[PDB]
Amino acid sequence: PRAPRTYSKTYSTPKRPYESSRLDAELKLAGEFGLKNKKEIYRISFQLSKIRRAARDLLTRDEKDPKRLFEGNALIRRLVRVGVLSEDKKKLDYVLALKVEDFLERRLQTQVYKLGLAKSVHHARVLITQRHIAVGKQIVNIPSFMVRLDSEKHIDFAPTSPFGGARPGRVARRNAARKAEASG
Amino acid sequence: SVGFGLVYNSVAEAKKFEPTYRLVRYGLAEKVEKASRQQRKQKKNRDKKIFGTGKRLAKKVARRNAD
């Protein structure tokens, strides 16, 4: 018989659904960081809880233990690679105290808006879902990318995208045809 | 795009080693069309039920039908 293929969940519905404070705060963060849905904050909180629990069960063990050293170094290396934390802080206080807002204000969706090549987080989302933007060599169509500064070093536009040339486009072609018909 | 590619030293080795379906797809060979899986399996079932060549059985059946 077919060997099993594993799947996993990525988001956690909070224990109580109706908090006039929690719901309101998560609505603020979703609106101010350009998040179309609530399951996205749910999953980002799931990852944050996972990493915080890893830090907690790492810290509960005594100092200088080689397992602790290795796990902490690997976690710090991954977190530096993603870049949400300054690369000159090894006290682990910031990685344990990392909040959802701090985590979200580093992913590429905020980066494009703050650099100004989209002028709107919603406009950036539509550009990504329409595929007229490539972070690097390969054209991307997913809003949740979490660049690791590789795309920052390789910042450019998609080849078959506006301002990339080599293609007027369908709407531009029909507009030109209509203008030619009107002129003569 | 990314794929696999293999170059043989000669057409003889290419024909010997390449799979038959691959040769048919490329055009280097062709496999004669035959009956479908169910039909050939049914043929094998019938001639496994039949014992012997079957010519004598057919002749006996024809003789019995005649008389």
Binding site: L27, K28, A30, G31, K36, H122, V126 | -
Partner: protein, 57 residues
Amino acid sequence: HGSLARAGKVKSQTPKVEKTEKPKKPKGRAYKRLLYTRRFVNVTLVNGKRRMNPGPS
């Protein structure tokens, strides 16, 4: 007993009000932005309870 009748009386006597024509709401990435605008730019009722859906006075 004896009331095994008049099933859905108000259901029957309810006047059939049809559906009003209205522009379609934009759902997806738009809806969260519309709620953002409807909630955080609206400051009309902040006197004593910070109401969000005021009834027509």
